Ligand binder design. Sequence first.
Ligand SMILES: CC(=O)SCCNC(=O)CCNC(=O)[C@H](O)C(C)(C)COP(=O)(O)OP(=O)(O)OC[C@H]1O[C@@H](n2cnc3c(N)ncnc32)[C@H](O)[C@@H]1OP(=O)(O)O
Ligand SMILES: CC(=O)SCCNC(=O)CCNC(=O)[C@H](O)C(C)(C)COP(=O)(O)OP(=O)(O)OC[C@H]1O[C@@H](n2cnc3c(N)ncnc32)[C@H](O)[C@@H]1OP(=O)(O)O
Ligand SMILES: [K+]
Lengths: 161, 165
Amino acid sequence: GSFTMDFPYDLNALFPERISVLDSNDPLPQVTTVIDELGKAQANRHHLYLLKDGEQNGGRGVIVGFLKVGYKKLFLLDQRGAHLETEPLCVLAFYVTETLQRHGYGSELFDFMLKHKQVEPAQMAYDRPSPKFLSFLEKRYDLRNSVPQVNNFVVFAGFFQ
Amino acid sequence: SFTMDFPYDLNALFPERISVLDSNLSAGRKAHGRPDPLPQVTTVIDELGKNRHHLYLLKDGEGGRGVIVGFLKVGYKKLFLLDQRGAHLETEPLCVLAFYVTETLQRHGYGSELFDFMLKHKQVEPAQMAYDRPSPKFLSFLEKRYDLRNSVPQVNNFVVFAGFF
Ligand SMILES: CC(=O)SCCNC(=O)CCNC(=O)[C@H](O)C(C)(C)COP(=O)(O)OP(=O)(O)OC[C@H]1O[C@@H](n2cnc3c(N)ncnc32)[C@H](O)[C@@H]1OP(=O)(O)O
Ligand SMILES: CC(=O)SCCNC(=O)CCNC(=O)[C@H](O)C(C)(C)COP(=O)(O)OP(=O)(O)OC[C@H]1O[C@@H](n2cnc3c(N)ncnc32)[C@H](O)[C@@H]1OP(=O)(O)O
Ligand SMILES: [K+]
């Protein structure tokens, strides 16, 4: 249980963000309890996935990572450098808490999104991805061959077709 | 209300800022024996919806589970705007991106309570922000409650008023 709210049906359907918390199958970092604040110190909605793992505090546990995807209208270059407008699903944010990286949490988060969006990794665009995320994509999803862009998004060979 | 523990680095990098605040006029009304009627609701457990943007949720409170009666989402956006004489102008104001109060409770002052809370806490006036594709009811809201009447025509789907400049 991650939320304690009741939503009217209309508000829920028009809710500007889609959010999912899933449980996971180690050094615990320091945490803060969030109560009423997160992040503090015909519409195509982005989908935020959060991963929980642990039984701290009678099962409450800890959110160890998040993944945000979404549709974005992108003007891309193709294989022959021709221009092409398109609206793929994009990874917009991807993070696992530092001390728990390289423990498989990211893979779990990413896999859940694929299964449920029924998209493959080569069919998405990646917004300004970090070195670690590139490595992750190259090593765990065999995404090796990129088609050069000038708009800060990365897309791989399979995307075209 | 949330029941999660966030690591500090994850919290600081969290891609969205979200705030839930309790309603005063909802509390006052219930307290004086004339609470507003709640529609049928769904209990959320692990699913919602089935420069960071800031999402505000207004809770009608119980002391059990309250009810979210409205939401307001703002965020900074880089915009290429036209001014009053049509000169081009790039600027990055706070924008309203989404604004909704559940249907049966519209026109009870709830939208005003959310909008006022955002203005105080973001410390902006309504004329200094831009409005992304606002619905007719929201325009009405702006015109009637905040005296935002004079629009400066744009071609990019955002609405801004004279005071903005
Ligand atoms: C487009 C944007 O959203 S950019 C994403 C934001 N990320 C950052 O700023 C820094 C790193 N942050 C992270 O959250 C993670 O490292 C992620 C999200 C990229 C991957 O999630 P993890 O839980 O770490 O991935 P998981 O453990 O499932 O798989 C591990 C693989 O990811 C990569 N990886 C994870 N940590 C590192 C690291 N420190 N250096 C290099 N590669 C790394 C490697 O491919 C690794 O495989 P290896 O152990 O065989 O070298
Ligand atoms: C940028 C984007 O997000 S566009 C906004 C999305 N809106 C919609 O899809 C439809 C309407 N949805 C709503 O959620 C609301 O009516 C809001 C958010 C626009 C205003 O919230 P409320 O809680 O209803 O506002 P509040 O009760 O404080 O003030 C009422 C004023 O809003 C306006 N308003 C509210 N409902 C209506 C309506 N059916 N018709 C016309 N104006 C309305 C009027 O100006 C009204 O003043 P009046 O009663 O003197 O005419
Ligand atoms: K509360």
